[PDB]
Design an enzyme around this catalytic site. Sequence first.
Site, PDB file in Angstrom:
ATOM      1  N   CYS B 169      75.698 -40.689 -24.175  1.00  0.00           N
ATOM      2  CA  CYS B 169      77.044 -40.270 -23.811  1.00  0.00           C
ATOM      3  C   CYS B 169      77.159 -39.824 -22.364  1.00  0.00           C
ATOM      4  CB  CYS B 169      77.498 -39.112 -24.704  1.00  0.00           C
ATOM      5  SG  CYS B 169      76.874 -39.202 -26.368  1.00  0.00           S
ATOM      6  N   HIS B 309      83.132 -32.198 -22.527  1.00  0.00           N
ATOM      7  CA  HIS B 309      82.551 -33.303 -23.272  1.00  0.00           C
ATOM      8  C   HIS B 309      83.281 -33.458 -24.600  1.00  0.00           C
ATOM      9  CE1 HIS B 309      79.705 -36.273 -24.441  1.00  0.00           C
ATOM     10  NE2 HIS B 309      79.228 -35.549 -25.434  1.00  0.00           N
ATOM     11  N   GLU B 320      78.970 -26.580 -26.564  1.00  0.00           N
ATOM     12  CA  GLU B 320      79.631 -26.676 -25.262  1.00  0.00           C
ATOM     13  C   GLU B 320      80.404 -25.407 -24.940  1.00  0.00           C
ATOM     14  OE1 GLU B 320      82.243 -29.995 -24.645  1.00  0.00           O
ATOM     15  OE2 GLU B 320      82.196 -29.647 -22.467  1.00  0.00           O
ATOM     16  N   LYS B 338      88.622 -36.783 -25.315  1.00  0.00           N
ATOM     17  CA  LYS B 338      88.271 -37.544 -26.510  1.00  0.00           C
ATOM     18  C   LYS B 338      89.258 -37.307 -27.651  1.00  0.00           C
ATOM     19  CE  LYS B 338      83.330 -37.960 -25.432  1.00  0.00           C
ATOM     20  NZ  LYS B 338      83.408 -37.177 -24.133  1.00  0.00           N
ATOM     21  N   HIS B 343      85.512 -41.620 -28.132  1.00  0.00           N
ATOM     22  CA  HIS B 343      84.196 -41.592 -27.512  1.00  0.00           C
ATOM     23  C   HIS B 343      83.777 -43.028 -27.224  1.00  0.00           C
ATOM     24  CE1 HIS B 343      80.395 -40.391 -26.228  1.00  0.00           C
ATOM     25  NE2 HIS B 343      79.911 -39.772 -27.297  1.00  0.00           N
ATOM     26  N   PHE B 402      73.594 -37.610 -26.402  1.00  0.00           N
ATOM     27  CA  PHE B 402      72.520 -37.672 -27.398  1.00  0.00           C
ATOM     28  C   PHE B 402      71.178 -37.917 -26.724  1.00  0.00           C
ATOM     29  CE2 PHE B 402      75.263 -37.358 -30.894  1.00  0.00           C
ATOM     30  CZ  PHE B 402      76.317 -38.260 -30.804  1.00  0.00           C
TER      31      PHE B 402
END
Lengths: 414, 414
Positions: B169, B309, B320, B338, B343, B402
């Site tokens: 990501c 994110h 986060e 998102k 995503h 990830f």
Amino acid sequence: QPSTANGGFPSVVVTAVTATTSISPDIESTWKGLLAGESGIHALEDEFVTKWDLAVKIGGHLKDPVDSHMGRLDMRRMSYVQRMGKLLGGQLWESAGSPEVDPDRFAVVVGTGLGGAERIVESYDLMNAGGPRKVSPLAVQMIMPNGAAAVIGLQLGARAGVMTPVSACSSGSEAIAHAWRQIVMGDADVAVCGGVEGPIEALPIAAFSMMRAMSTRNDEPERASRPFDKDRDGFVFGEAGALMLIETEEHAKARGAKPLARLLGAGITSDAFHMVAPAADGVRAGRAMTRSLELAGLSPADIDHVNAHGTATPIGDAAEANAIRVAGCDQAAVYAPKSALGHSIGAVGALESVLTVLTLRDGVIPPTLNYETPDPEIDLDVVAGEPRYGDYRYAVNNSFGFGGHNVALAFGRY
Amino acid sequence: QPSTANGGFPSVVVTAVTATTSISPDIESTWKGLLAGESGIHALEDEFVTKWDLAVKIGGHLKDPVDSHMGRLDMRRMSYVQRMGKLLGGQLWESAGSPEVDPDRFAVVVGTGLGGAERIVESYDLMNAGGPRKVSPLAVQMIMPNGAAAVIGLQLGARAGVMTPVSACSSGSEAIAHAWRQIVMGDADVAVCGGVEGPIEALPIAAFSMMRAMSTRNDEPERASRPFDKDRDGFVFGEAGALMLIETEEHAKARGAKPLARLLGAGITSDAFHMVAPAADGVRAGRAMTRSLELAGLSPADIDHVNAHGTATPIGDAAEANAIRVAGCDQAAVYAPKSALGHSIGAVGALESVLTVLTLRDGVIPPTLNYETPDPEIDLDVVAGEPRYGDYRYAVNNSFGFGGHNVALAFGRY
Ligand SMILES: CCCCS(=O)(=O)Nc1ccc2[nH]c(C#N)c(C)c2c1
Ligand SMILES: CCCCS(=O)(=O)Nc1ccc2[nH]c(C#N)c(C)c2c1
Ligand code: NA
Ligand code: NA
């Protein structure tokens, strides 16, 4: 303008190396074998060669297969390149004396050519046979190409960045370049870096041979890889993975680590010429060499040794000969280790960087195998016959990857 | 210690942006739609959903499919991500006024999550049905994950490096980070950078849903992606690709290019915690934010806006929130795009970097969709309801991929 020589960049040293190759699982044994004139390249005994009647029937599998070290759990939770990364990561750390470093100042940069690609096919087959719930919850982490670097960073506790550059044949050298950047920009004090790559199989052979990129000298496998020789006819696969530990000189001194060499600068350029052929004029590849010298603070007259990319394709070796001349390095003693170890794509730049370190440490260049009738159109000082012992002060390792990715690494004797 | 603020690094500006998204093929139309509260996330109409009875039946395909722009030749010589890269590369260059730059000072850095992987299966099938000579001579250059960056560098003539970082990501943001490094270290004056990614399909859905990572709110698709909401249940796929043109301020001024924003610093750290779960404490992710501020020369009090994110997984948004607090940025106005765009893995960090630029340019943050009952355990100033017009001077874009890869990009209003 900062350089290593003028102190604008911190001094960075290589303190440990590890590699698995077609000659040996032990880098020091690989080195001894190279000096003895050994080749890792043999007739392929795999059933897949006869199943497909492949035009290429030669190559170097690892002397010690990675999975001879992998139990049931690792075989089920990691892709091949991740298993190789875990193996080499633990070996490297042991070789370094298992140091206790600050995780927050410790980076991992590991390149690879492709990634966990065999797990894509496996997941594809599992879902086709059993539906979406038969795909493993581990599939994403095995497939993702950052997976090998992630495994190593998790294994060793690196919290100052875990990076994966992809640039085909230059991936393993580019990884070392980016690790050097991570240290000299101040983001880390120590880094594990290098490259891993998958094994020889039928589909990789078919894909590269359909480019006419590969040697078909099947009757004399150890004679097939002939970089800079008049009679060369393409590259040979030779499996490998390799990692090195780099760190600031002050970090090494503070923990009593004895440096093997200095990593002085790194140049990254690109050809923008062709998707697989290198530019004939060697200009941008030469500029990568020149850039590594600018960052090191060296002039071309300082370069005693070039560890060539030297894949033994007709067009690649010719382009690199032009590159070396463009960079003013054509009086350097040249070694083409793919003559003995073959091409390991995303690992090979890291492997050859390790060999460059050992050349500086030991004051010796192994013979380029099969250099017997030098190409009349290339005039380089290729080391051949037997190892050349010499006063090598500085060296450049070249890797010029498919796609036009040029990486040059400048190293110095410690 | 060099910073952008103190002149140790050259000033770098963003001069052009392009993106294709589930809302629009036109970035300015995407932006207008986000401000209008539009979602790109709908019920998936693909046959593969009913074929497999997938648990996830929602997502955002591109509004304008890449291949509606691809003729027979491009469909046969490029992987999907390469076709997307060629499309966006040409769009970006046109948007920039088709400038004539020095190829030797021009770099390309394009991240991606996986690469040309569908061409692996195709080559596999071709060889199984017809033997090794049925694999294309173009297979290697289509499969290699550096292929999209190579296509763009060849298309636009970039000879100062063509790089491909892979970090799931965070790939598209990491690409922008490395392009910034390539300029501030002096290797280039201008760079095209960003990320591309493949489309939604059954196997990607199966792989991420078996992690329990994905929302299954199939009855109300536009309501499914709920970053920082109490009722969130995972991420939604939303296809995208995005590129930006960055260059030194002096280079932009010399060709009359009007900057959209400044790119001030980039922090890359890693969790070394888990192969897919982010560290709960948010410490290393927060440190990436802090590092981007150190390189920019900003303090946390300067940060008016964070482009989160914000994937809407339970554990990701919680981590986060800790990261933002750790970095001292929890008074910033937060946007989680998102919520509207989903995503796009290796592209999304680049897309959100473009959105961050537009927020600074236009002094407005779009509403985070579906933020209706804020998670009692997270206390961030999430913009919601309608766009918030405000005096945004500096912003950080977060991407935490990830594998534990943390990238933060610090931008400033021009
Ligand atoms: C030195 C040889 C280079 C071959 S490669 O370049 O094709 N890379 C590559 C990468 C991952 C791989 N996984 C598997 C499996 N199973 C293979 C056969 C495999 C091959
Ligand atoms: C936003 C969705 C992300 C999906 S992805 O992460 O699985 N990446 C990814 C990369 C290359 C790909 N090629 C092809 C084909 N054909 C697919 C389906 C494909 C998918
Ligand atoms: Na070399
Ligand atoms: Na973001």
